[PDB]
Design a protein around this nucleic acid. Structure first.
Ligand SMILES: [Mg+2]
Ligand SMILES: [Zn+2]
Ligand SMILES: [Zn+2]
Lengths: 55, 687, 1113, 73, 106
RNA sequence: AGCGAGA
């Protein structure tokens, strides 16, 4: 469902559109979540052009 | 630099004299300030105030300018040096060479090996002593060629092609003499170098020490590096010509001569043949085409899994056993090239299928077999590509017959949008977007019409759809319509180009077109610069990530999702599983429905394991990774996982850091873009 | 009828349109500008035709602006006038030979006046040896040929820009007044609603402050500038009252550190702007300010300095633009539409041609000379001074010399082939003194601008790290007297397309509307259709208002340069491949024979004749006597003239400059006719390559990935071969020890090694030599050297001369060999003009005949390049049904995805040309052939044709022609309708299962020969301050094991080989001899030491007062 | 990544990397001693990298024939 | 010279005492080489008395010229007769009349 | 030091 005013949110749900700075996510969710974030984002940008790099 | 020193000494001496004579405070103070400025200029000229300039009005190279920058001492002379015992030449494809071989012109080899050949021809008494031998070689006396063949033998050599974007930019071959002045490279390694034969210059280096020769012969040998260190996909795989030849060989054409026909009541099937040899002997006659369905009694190729399981079941010893195979002769001739143990494939050889075959072959069989099979495959591919009958002619480029009707249909909408704008219905931006949408739709429509208009055997569709090279966008631009052309700012020209290159672009269409190509060429340069800088950064950060221990036994780990549960209830494999969970060591034992362990802790998690996990119905698996590695120094073998290149567990000395960084940087440039960044700048920001 | 020149090969063309204008004098860009600089009578007449109001030469202009000059008091003055040139001191060929610069004396009549008493003293002053331009359009400097390429630079004037401010998301406007050597004021508007000066890049202002500095009053500011609210805003915010106060604040801010005064402030501003001493806009600059602001549109131009009118109008325009007005009318000035300017628009990018560059350098030298004069005037005794003793010419001659040598825009001529030399002219480089450098240059200057159409080629461009900065002029482009680039357009009125041609600049095209050349005309001068294609102001190729399109494109191919205009079927090639093909048309080597292309373009001739490598009869007459060296022709009136050929002269890039006559001893020849062709010319047409039979099959992987396989026939019959001449120089200098000597007097020389050498220590002429052979025998005085006792004992064992004079003789560099064409002995003993110190300079010319082989780079004209994988015997070559073996076999896989099927089309057409055709017009003409020009329904075999660039052979016509391909010798058509034939395999013998595209392609031998690329190094010279042996094939190239190679080596885990490389292969000065010894004697390679670069680093860090120590442990 | 690199305990590598003047000034003020443990450093000074064939378990392998081989002699 | 005993590398500020300890001399004249005979000057920027002999194994004046005179200093010119390559190793120092501050730390 | 060029 599209995130809308009056909706209960999570502790990590991206509110708006666009990326988020990794410092903030680190401070909120510890080291593991920021690790997973960074790997996911870099892998995404690479995958977007069809180049395969192991995680 | 010496002059700066002279300035300092002059001013110091003058100061000494000024203090000695007894001078007003003003003069001596000024002289002291001058001495200060001189020492300043000496240690760093130009940092404060205008740089001290020399003849020609140029700053003097201060004593510190020797150290900084690209041209400083650190990154031109210490880590990167010019080296003796090296050569360079243009490269020409040689398909007659084995994968572990490279041509080397006679003069270049003679010069490179001049010490060794001297030694041998003095040992052989062709020359009395060293200096007579040196004279013998400097005039290339006829006797010094045979000795040269003797010495070069079994002496590995490295071949670099700048830039070395990744580890496979430099490989060791066994050199062989060739006549004229051109390093004859093996085609199958072309991709590894990304070296394509139109005036590339490949440098040659010659290992000397016993350790260096062992390293080159063992670690670096071209036949020992097939799989990419990045994603492990084979890099010696046939491509371009070979893949096309194999696609032509192994494809099936119904209705061809010598086909199978089970008709009875008048004659037998007349499609079966006693042995593959019989099939080739028939093909020599103008009877059997190589691409016809037939039934051959094979006695030397292993049947696929189902036929083995049915006819033999348990221990089918194929080298003597015989079985009836309903396939094309070309596929049989292909399957003879694979090792004995590999089952019969019986599939059309798209580049994808070739890649899968080579991957499985490397996973199972030892590397040497992989090299031999790949080389045989290259040979057959070239031969049958020659016979494939793929050529390009205007007549072979068929425009779509419905083009004009589509053009009219969509130009009508374009005129309608023009009219609506002329009545002020919408602003310039809105009508630009409307035209963009209308013309993109027209683009897709003509592309579909062209695709469905082509037959399958056409040279262009044959080359593109076999995976050999190129994409259908290029075909559609070639015949049909090129499309929307990019504004030099980056937007889309709403004209747009409506002409095929076969039909020939008009003057203005060409002028519009030039924008995009020029911008692409410009964008290549800056992007490769930034990519190189990024690789430098990543390498430095990871310059000290090397394996140290086999295992830390750390309980900690990460979780990877693998397949996601379907809403209807089903396990669909996650699309991006091949780069996430493959080649990883399980941190914890898998559990199924609170049942036994399908695969316990400490397994490489290769393809059968993931297949078993998917079949059993488990998604989340805890795998070990470098992130949660307990060992303080570097990482451990097990947590890092499988070496993608070697195909087995990592060694206790591998510099996985450098491999990592180079693998991240290698897809630079080919990493293109289409405000939040999303390209190489975005990667840079993330790191 | 091409006509063009008297001697004309009948190359029929597929053109549908007829050019109204012949292709201009492609070399005019240089010669006309230099003539303008001189003030030649030819330039005088040309300027008279089109603006006789003010014919003044560049020199004349410099002298005029310079003269008169006065001292500080004004008691005496000096003036210049009447520049003039004497006859050149020597002819072109001699100047080329003896290194001396082809130059003529320059004379100026000076005039010294004394105001106190009244006298005028005048005499010619001999400014110096001006370098002149040869007729071909190049200068000769130090013997070499040098060309002054045109520079692209932003014209001065007033430029308005607008940008959004992300901080407030508002459109803020700014203006730059760009002068020539001025001050750079800018009226920038910030997000805050206040307009403010930023004068000479110093910390902003309010504009009203400046205005009050000129002498404006607040009520006057409201009167002129009050209409806008920002102006009232800044008026109140100015909080600054009094003209004295305004000038005080400005003076405090402009030259701080000096004591403010109410006397030296008006002078400051007035000198800074309204004095020509420091703020010259030049003519183009002032013209642009006047046009853009519409102040003096009617008046002629002079006194480039500005007026307060100018600046106040600029502020007015800026504020109106910020308001959003469309048009403004200055009091007493024409209204002009208020709009923002562009930067890259060629109404702002002007061309500094050779004349402008040399004039600027002259002006700089003149400023220096005038400074010297003015300085010495304080110390000049009155009445004892005359101009000749007053003028010191040395700075001017020094400036011109240092310009023509080492100036960026004075480039070493590039005579790879006539086309390369031609295209080096007409080359516009955006980088140089006062231009954008590659680094600082952004990514937006490199891209095409819609204004480029007809003024600069979007296709031709370097592919390296230079794309965009350097381009080539369009064919029809002509340079504005103000330095802009004009293009021809036919004017059409009431839809009557007359032949009235008008040259329009960028701005004028922008105002009007221009059609396209290939818009069909009804033959009545009117458009046969509605919906005629059109371009407009902003550069948008948009749908068209039918009729009343004010202008049109003189012809197709107006947007292409000379190089790319020679690519047949260009319209079928992608821009990338066309760009490459144009680039590679400038790298073809001149072959021994040269053959004109079967398929080409109308430009194959004009390029050859304008390249100026080809002898053209000056006046008509009958050839009296012709020989291989010269042609003597008897003119129609008594007089006879002899053209002497140039035989095997070395060109600037080592190629041959051979000329051979093409006229017999009885022919009558008219003026403008070619009488002796050149390197890459065949009967007047540029022939850079050869027409070879080609197939498009992937053949056994030898033509893998754009690799090329050739018939040995091309080696046997010698259709691909190049002459290369290289010169080796050696000088007998003088030393403290003694002097070198060039003669057979050599130490320890074998009899044989001295056999080739003549008594004078010069190898015998026309002699075969090999790498290392003594070209010239020279010996240097050894002075004093401590000998070794072991050598003394040796010398005793042989009882021979110990000898002193050290041996250093000119020897063939490694990897070179050939015949000795010529030896030149320029000696001080012969009283030659040797540079100070050398006593005898000898140059030996060695020539080699290079044949085609593996590694050599070939390419067609459509970017289809490649090295030669193999050269098969003619027997195992695919041969057609008739038994003709193919010459080349390209790879099919390269065609589609490189998107350059023009070659394929060319291939088909080539075959059609080679076989010859005959359209079967038995029952009328075939429909597809209806539009074909006459005399194209029939063509004998080997009939040359031409397809113009954007108006050539339509694919339907190609199909039709390919259908009728009259048989070769017997009744058999080797190529079917499709263009593909059945080819027999040379090796197996069986015919190939499917037909193969076969035809004739025109390909070329590019100058990237393998012999010049192959290189090897085991041991040789090492660098000075560091080891790590010297790089470069020139010296002895040690191949750079750079950083990425180290990374790759580490990634393998290969450590010992890395250490070996970086220590004992490169740097370690002690290990190196040890590894050599081990190799020679067969022992284990020793252990590596410490590389010698680490210690130089240690010493340098220590030298920075950084105590660096290597602790043991 | 840049900061992580420049925070290493090896001034000879940081200096090789970037912004030479500042890094050397800092390391000098701290009397910092580089232990020469990374890869760039071992390259610069020209001794064997501690990776692959250079680490202390392979770099010093003892190789000798077998007693049976000595018996074959 | 140097060996594999490089276990630790140390960098630090060099005090004036250290600088004059490194130096083998004290250049005090701005003279490189004689314009005529092309030889280094005394106490110049290339002084053989400080940085060693230009050509190996002889002093400036030439009193000693062979290998057996290794490590000896000629009294006449003071040149230490040894290998020439040491000229890449030996440092000088200029005793500034007044103190100066190093730029890098400023 | 400066030019031009190949990949
Ligand atoms: Mg290439
Ligand atoms: Zn671990
Ligand atoms: Zn002495």
């Amino acid at each position: 469902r599209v995130l809308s005013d009056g909706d209960h949110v999570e502790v990590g749900q991206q509110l708006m559109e666009g990326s988020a700075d990794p410092h903030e996510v680190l401070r909120v969710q510890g080291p593991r979540e920021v690790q997973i974030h960074l790997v996911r984002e870099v892998q995404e940008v690479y995958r977007a052009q069809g180049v395969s790099i192991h995680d | 630099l010496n002059d700066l020193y002279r300035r300092v000494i002059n001013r110091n001496n003058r100061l000494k004299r000024l203090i000695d004579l007894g001078a007003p405070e003003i003069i001596v103070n000024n002289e002291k300030r001058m001495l200060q400025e001189s020492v300043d200029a000496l240690f760093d000229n130009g940092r404060r105030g205008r740089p001290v300039t020399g003849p020609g009005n140029r700053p003097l190279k201060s004593l510190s300018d020797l150290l900084k920058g690209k041209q400083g001492r650190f990154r031109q002379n210490l880590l990167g040096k010019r080296v003796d015992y090296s050569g360079r030449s243009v490269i020409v494809v040689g398909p007659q060479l084995k994968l572990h071989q490279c041509g080397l012109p006679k003069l270049m080899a003679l010069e490179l090996f001049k010490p060794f050949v001297m030694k041998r021809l003095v040992d052989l008494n062709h020359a009395q002593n060293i200096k007579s031998a040196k004279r013998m070689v400097e005039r290339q006396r006829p006797q010094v060629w045979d000795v040269l063949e003797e010495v070069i033998a079994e002496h590995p050599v490295l071949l670099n092609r700048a830039p070395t974007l990744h580890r496979l930019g430099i490989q060791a071959f066994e050199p062989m003499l060739v006549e004229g002045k051109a390093i004859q490279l093996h085609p199958l390694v072309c991709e590894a170098f990304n070296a394509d034969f139109d005036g590339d210059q490949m440098a040659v280096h010659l290992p000397l020490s016993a350790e260096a020769q062992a390293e080159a012969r063992i670690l670096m040998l071209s036949s020992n590096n097939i799989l990419s260190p990045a994603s492990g996909r084979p890099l010696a795989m046939p491509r371009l010509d070979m893949v096309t030849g194999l696609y032509y060989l192994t494809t099936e054409v119904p209705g061809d001569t010598g086909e199978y026909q089970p008709a009875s009541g008048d004659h037998p099937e007349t499609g079966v043949y006693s042995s593959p040899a019989e099939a080739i002997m028939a093909a020599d006659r103008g009877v059997l085409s190589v691409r016809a369905k037939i039934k051959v009694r094979l006695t030397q190729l292993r049947p696929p899994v189902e036929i083995e399981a049915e006819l033999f079941g348990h221990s089918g010893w194929q080298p003597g056993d015989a079985w009836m195979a309903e396939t094309t002769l070309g596929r049989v001739m292909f399957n003879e090239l694979l090792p004995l143990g590999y089952p019969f494939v019986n599939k059309q050889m798209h580049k994808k299928v070739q890649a899968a075959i080579i991957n499985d072959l490397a996973e199972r069989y030892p590397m040497i077999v992989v090299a031999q099979t790949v080389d045989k495959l290259k040979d057959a591919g070239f031969y049958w590509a020659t016979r494939s009958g793929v050529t390009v002619s205007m007549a072979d480029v068929l425009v779509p017959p419905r083009k004009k009707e589509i053009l009219d249909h969509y130009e009508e909408r374009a005129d309608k949008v023009e009219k609506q704008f002329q009545r002020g219905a919408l602003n310039h931006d809105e009508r630009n977007e409307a035209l963009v949408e209308i013309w993109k739709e027209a683009t897709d429509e003509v592309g579909q019409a062209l695709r469905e208009h082509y037959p399958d055997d056409n040279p262009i569709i044959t080359i593109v759809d076999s995976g050999a090279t190129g994409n259908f966008t290029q075909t559609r631009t070639l015949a049909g319509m090129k499309g929307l052309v990019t504004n030099p700012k980056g937007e889309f020209i709403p004209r747009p180009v409506k002409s095929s290159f076969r039909e020939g672009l008009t003057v203005l269409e060409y002028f519009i077109n030039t924008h995009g190509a020029r911008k692409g060429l410009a964008d290549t340069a800056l992007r490769t610069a930034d990519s190189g800088y990024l690789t430098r950064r990543l390498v430095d950060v990871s310059q000290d990530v090397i394996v140290r221990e086999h295992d830390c036994q750390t309980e900690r780990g990460i979780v990877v999702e693998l397949a996601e549960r379907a809403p209807d209830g089903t396990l669909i494999r996650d699309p991006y599983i091949e780069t996430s969970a493959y080649a990883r060591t399980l941190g914890t034992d898998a559990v199924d429905e609170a049942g036994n362990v399908i695969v316990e802790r400490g397994q490489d998690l290769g393809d059968p394991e993931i297949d078993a996990l998917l079949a059993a119905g488990i998604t989340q698996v805890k795998v070990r990774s470098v992130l949660t590695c307990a060992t303080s120094t570097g990482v451990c073998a097990t947590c890092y996982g499988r070496s993608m290149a070697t195909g087995k567990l990592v060694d206790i000395g591998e510099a996985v850091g450098i491999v990592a960084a180079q693998s991240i940087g290698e897809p630079g440039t080919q990493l293109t873009m289409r405000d939040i960044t999303g390209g190489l700048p975005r990667v840079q920001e993330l790191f | 009828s091409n006509n063009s020149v008297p001697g004309a090969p009948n190359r029929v063309s597929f053109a549908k349109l007829r050019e109204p204008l012949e292709v201009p004098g492609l070399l005019d860009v240089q010669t006309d500008s230099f003539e303008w600089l001189i003030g030649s009578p030819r330039w005088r007449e040309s300027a008279a035709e089109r603006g006789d109001v003010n014919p003044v030469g560049g020199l004349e202009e410099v002298l005029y602006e310079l003269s008169p000059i006065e001292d500080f008091s004004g008691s005496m003055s000096l003036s210049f006038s009447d520049p003039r040139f004497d006859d050149v001191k020597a002819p072109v060929d001699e100047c080329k030979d003896k290194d001396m610069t082809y130059a003529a004396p320059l004379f100026v009549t000076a005039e010294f006046i004394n105001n106190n008493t009244g006298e005028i003293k005048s005499q010619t002053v001999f400014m110096g040896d001006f370098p002149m331009m040869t007729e071909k359009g190049t200068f000769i400097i130090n013997g070499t040929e040098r060309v002054v390429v045109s520079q692209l630079v932003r014209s001065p004037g007033v430029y308005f820009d607008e940008t959004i401010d992300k901080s407030t998301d508002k459109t803020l406007h700014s203006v730059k007044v760009i002068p020539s050597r001025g001050a750079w004021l800018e009226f920038d508007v910030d997000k805050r609603d206040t307009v403010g000066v930023r004068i000479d890049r110093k910390r902003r202002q309010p504009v009203t402050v400046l205005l009050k500095a000129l002498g404006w009053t607040s009520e006057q500011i409201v009167e002129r500038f009050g209409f806008s609210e920002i102006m009232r805003s800044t008026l109140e915010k100015d909080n600054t009252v009094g003209t004295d106060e305004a000038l005080l604040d400005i003076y405090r801010k402009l030259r701080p550190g000096e004591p403010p005064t109410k006397e030296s402030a008006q002078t400051l501003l007035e000198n800074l702007f309204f004095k020509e001493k420091r703020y010259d806009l030049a003519r183009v600059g002032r013209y642009k300010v006047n046009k853009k602001l519409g102040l003096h549109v009617g008046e002629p131009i002079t006194s480039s300095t500005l007026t307060e009118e100018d600046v106040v109008a600029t502020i007015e325009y800026l504020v109106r633009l910020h308001e959003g007005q469309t048009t403004m009318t200055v009091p007493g000035g024409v209204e002009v539409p208020v709009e923002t300017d562009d930067i890259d628009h060629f109404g702002n990018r002007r061309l500094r041609t050779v004349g402008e560059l040399i004039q600027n350098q002259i002006r700089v030298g003149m400023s220096r000379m005038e400074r010297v004069v003015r300085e010495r005037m304080t110390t000049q005794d009155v009445e004892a001074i005359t101009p000749q003793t007053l003028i010191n010419i040395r700075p001017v001659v020094a400036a011109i010399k240092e310009f023509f040598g080492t100036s960026q825009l004075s480039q070493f001529m590039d005579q790879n082939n006539p086309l390369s030399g031609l295209t080096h002219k007409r080359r516009l480089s955006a980088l140089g003194p006062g231009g954008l450098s590659r680094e600082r240059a952004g990514l937006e200057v490199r891209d095409v601008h819609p204004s480029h159409y007809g003024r600069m080629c979007p296709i031709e461009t370097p592919e390296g790290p230079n794309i965009g900065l350097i381009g080539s002029l369009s064919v029809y482009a002509r340079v504005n007297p103000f330095g802009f680039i004009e293009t021809p357009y036919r004017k059409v009125v009431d839809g009557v397309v007359s032949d009235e041609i008008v040259y329009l600049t960028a701005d004028e095209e922008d105002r009007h509307v221009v059609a396209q050349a290939n818009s069909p005309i009804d033959a009545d001068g009117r458009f046969v259709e509605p919906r005629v294609l059109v371009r407009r102001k902003a550069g948008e190729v948009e749908y068209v208002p039918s009729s009343e399109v004010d202008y049109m494109d003189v012809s197709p191919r107006q947007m292409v340069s000379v190089a790319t205009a020679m690519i047949p079927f260009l319209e079928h090639d992608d821009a990338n491949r066309a760009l490459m093909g144009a680039n590679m048309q400038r790298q073809a080597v001149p072959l021994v024979r040269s053959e004109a292309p079967l398929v080409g373009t109308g430009m194959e001739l004009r390029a050859a004749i304008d390249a100026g490598d080809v002898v053209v009869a000056e006046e008509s007459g009958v050839i009296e006597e012709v020989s291989a060296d010269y042609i003597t022709v008897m003119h129609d009136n008594g007089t006879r003239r002899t053209y002497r050929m140039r035989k095997f002269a070395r060109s600037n890039h080592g190629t041959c400059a051979n000329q051979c006559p093409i006229v017999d001893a009885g022919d009558r020849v008219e003026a403008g006719q070619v009488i002796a062709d050149g390197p890459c010319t065949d009967d007047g047409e540029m022939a850079l390559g050869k027409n070879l039979l080609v197939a498009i099959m992937p053949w056994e992987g030898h033509n893998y990935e754009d690799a090329i396989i050739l018939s040995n026939r091309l080696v046997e019959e010698d259709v691909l071969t190049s002459i290369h001449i290289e010169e080796h120089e050696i000088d007998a200098r003088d030393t403290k020890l003694g002097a070198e000597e060039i003669t057979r007097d050599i130490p320890n020389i074998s009899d044989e090694v001295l056999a080739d050498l003549d008594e004078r220590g010069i190898v015998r002429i026309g002699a075969e030599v090999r790498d290392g052979d003594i070209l010239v025998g020279k010996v240097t005085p050894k002075g004093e050297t401590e000998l070794t006792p072991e050598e003394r004992l040796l010398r005793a064992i042989f009882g021979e001369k110990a000898r002193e004079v050290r041996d250093t003789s000119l020897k063939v560099p490694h990897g070179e060999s050939g015949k000795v064409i010529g030896i030149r002995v320029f000696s001080r003993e012969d009283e030659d003009e040797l540079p100070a110190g050398v006593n005898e300079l000898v140059r030996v010319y060695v020539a080699q005949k290079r044949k085609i082989s593996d590694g050599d780079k070939l390419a067609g004209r459509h970017g289809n390049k490649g090295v030669i994988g193999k050269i098969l015997p003619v027997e195992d070559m695919p041969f057609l049904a008739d038994g003709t073996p193919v010459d080349i076999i390209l790879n099919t896989h390269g065609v589609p995805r490189r998107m350059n099927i023009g070659q394929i089309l060319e291939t088909h057409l080539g075959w059609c040309a080679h076989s010859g055709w005959k359209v079967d017009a038995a029952k009328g003409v075939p429909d597809w052939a209806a539009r074909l020009p006459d005399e194209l329904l029939e063509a004998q075999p080997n009939a040359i044709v031409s397809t113009p660039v954007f108006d050539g052979a339509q694919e339907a016509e190609l199909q039709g022609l390919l259908s009728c391909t009259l048989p070769n010798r017997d009744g058999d058509v080797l190529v079917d309708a499709d263009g593909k034939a059945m080819l027999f395999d040379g090796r197996s013998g069986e015919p190939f299962p499917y037909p193969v595209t076969v035809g004739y392609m025109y390909i070329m031998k590019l100058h990237h020969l393998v012999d010049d690329k192959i290189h090897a190094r085991s041991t040789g010279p090492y660098s000075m301050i560091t080891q790590q042996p010297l790089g470069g094939k020139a010296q002895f190239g040690g191949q750079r094991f750079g950083e990425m190679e180290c990374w790759a080596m580490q990634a393998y885990g290969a450590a010992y080989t890395l250490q070996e490389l970086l220590t004992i292969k490169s740097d370690d000065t002690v290990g190196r001899v040890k590894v050599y010894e081990a190799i020679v004697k067969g022992e284990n390679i020793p252990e590596p030491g410490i590389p010698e670069s680490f210690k130089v680093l240690l010493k340098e860090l220590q030298s920075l007062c950084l105590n660096v120590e290597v602790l043991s442990s | 990544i840049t900061k992580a690199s420049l925070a290493t305990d090896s001034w000879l590598s940081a200096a090789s990397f970037q912004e030479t003047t500042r890094v050397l000034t800092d390391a000098a003020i701290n009397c910092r001693s580089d232990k020469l443990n990374g890869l760039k450093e071992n390259v610069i000074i020209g001794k064997l990298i501690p990776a692959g064939t250079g680490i202390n378990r392979y770099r010093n392998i003892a190789v000798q024939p077998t007693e049976e081989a000595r018996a074959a002699a | 010279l140097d060996v594999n005993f490089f276990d630790e590398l140390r960098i630090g500020l060099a005090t004036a005492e250290d600088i004059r300890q490194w130096s083998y001399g004290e250049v005090k004249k701005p003279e490189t080489i004689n314009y005529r005979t092309l030889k280094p000057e005394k106490d110049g920027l290339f002084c053989e008395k400080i940085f060693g002999p230009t050509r190996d194994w002889e002093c400036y004046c030439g009193k000693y010229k062979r290998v057996r005179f290794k490590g000896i200093i000629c009294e006449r010119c003071g040149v230490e007769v040894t290998r020439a390559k040491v000229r890449r190793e030996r440092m000088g120092h200029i005793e500034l009349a007044a103190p100066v501050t190093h730029i890098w730390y400023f």
